[PDB]
Design a protein around this ligand. Structure first.
Ligand code: FES
Lengths: 127, 107, 123
């Protein structure tokens, strides 16, 4: 069975960089399909952020393409999201998920992460 | 950029009866339409892919039809944990876009 | 050039049809099997292939039922990997028809095929 465990700062100050890590176990990132990042806004509107293939190719949503950076680390088997210069807009619960691809049926996200809630608050938090 | 419209928006029902949600896209998508289930606890699962194909584990009471630009998601009975928010995406071209959402409540 | 009517094949059943004197395996896979197939790490395969590299529609597994070791025809729904077992020298294939154990060096070959509604055309 495949498992996706998410971790990272659940609260960042505006103008800073949000960083989330998605640890995968039971299947290697380099082995095959697509590794995506998506966010769920409080107003219930899912948005596809982007992905990184098993080869290492990136594909970002044009809406955020100039800010984010989805990298990986084959050794530890985990991919990351890095959304630069955040704003109150970026306040959402982020999900990492795997999507398969069959030439006929197309893409489909079959394995989802737990979901990491991030808040762009100006508040102070113990690191 | 294509955009879907999940209607009805957050409609409730009883403790065991059929319900039909829909998803209409701005442009034309072949049949590349998936359906997700967001549990109240935040757990999101895949239910249907390619407008009608069932995923592993999803009960037989889940259907899926439509084509062109109009789609569906029928259920047999909400008995008992069918209560969650349902979404729908397309994938004929990047970027992928989801629907507005459709919460399912029990009166 | 053989035509097979997919609409005739039930849920989790195997159908064998002749094509150029060689047996062609066709299985209408169940949702659970499809997941089982696409959830295997390449590190556990002597002939590394994703289920997607092998099938066009995840519902239809279409391959030549010729064991890659010495040519026997593998037995359906047998083996230690929920797929096919070759009685000749003990080669086990998974639900994607990949070689998992035994002397066979390769996964069951996939012939050229195209879909046309309820029927597929192997050849
Ligand atoms: S021919 Fe199948 S194992 Fe030898």
């Amino acid at each position: 069975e495949v498992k996706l465990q998410e971790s990272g700062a659940g609260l960042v100050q505006p103008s800073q960089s949000l960083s989330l890590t998605c640890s995968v176990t039971g299947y290697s990132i380099t082995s095959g399909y697509y590794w995506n990042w998506i966010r769920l806004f409080p107003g219930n509107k899912l948005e596809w952020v982007g992905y990184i293939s098993n080869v290492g190719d990136n594909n970002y949503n044009p809406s955020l393409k100039d800010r984010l950076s989805i990298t990986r680390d084959t050794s530890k088997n985990q991919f990351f999201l890095k959304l630069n210069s955040v704003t109150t807009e970026d306040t959402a619960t982020y999900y990492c998920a795997r999507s398969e691809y069959y030439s006929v049926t197309g893409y489909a996200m079959d394995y989802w992460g737990q979901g990491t809630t991030v808040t762009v608050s100006s508040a102070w938090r113990h690191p | 950029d294509i955009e879907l419209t999940q209607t009805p928006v957050s409609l409730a029902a009883s403790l065991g009866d059929r319900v039909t949600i829909s998803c209409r896209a701005s442009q034309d998508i072949n049949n590349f339409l998936n359906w997700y289930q967001q549990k109240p606890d935040g757990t999101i699962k895949l239910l249907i892919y390619y407008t009608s194909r069932l995923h592993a584990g999803v009960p037989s009471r889940f259907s899926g039809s439509g084509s062109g630009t109009d789609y569906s998601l029928t259920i047999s009975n909400l008995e008992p944990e069918d209560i969650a928010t349902y979404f729908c995406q397309h994938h004929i071209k990047f970027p992928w876009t989801f629907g507005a959402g459709t919460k399912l409540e029990i009166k | 050039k053989v035509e097979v009517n997919l609409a005739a094949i039930p849920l989790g059943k195997n159908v064998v049809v002749k094509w150029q004197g060689k047996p062609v395996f066709i299985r209408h896979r169940t949702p659970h099997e499809i997941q089982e197939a696409n959830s295997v790490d390449m590190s556990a395969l002597k002939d590394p292939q994703t289920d997607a590299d092998r099938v066009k529609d995840p519902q239809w597994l279409i391959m030549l039922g010729i064991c890659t070791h010495l040519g026997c025809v593998p037995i359906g729904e047998a083996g230690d990997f929920g797929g096919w077992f070759c009685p000749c020298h003990g080669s086990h294939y998974d639900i994607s028809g990949r070689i998992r154990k035994g002397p066979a060096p390769l996964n069951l070959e996939i012939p050229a095929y195209e879909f046309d509604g309820d029927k597929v055309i192997v050849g």
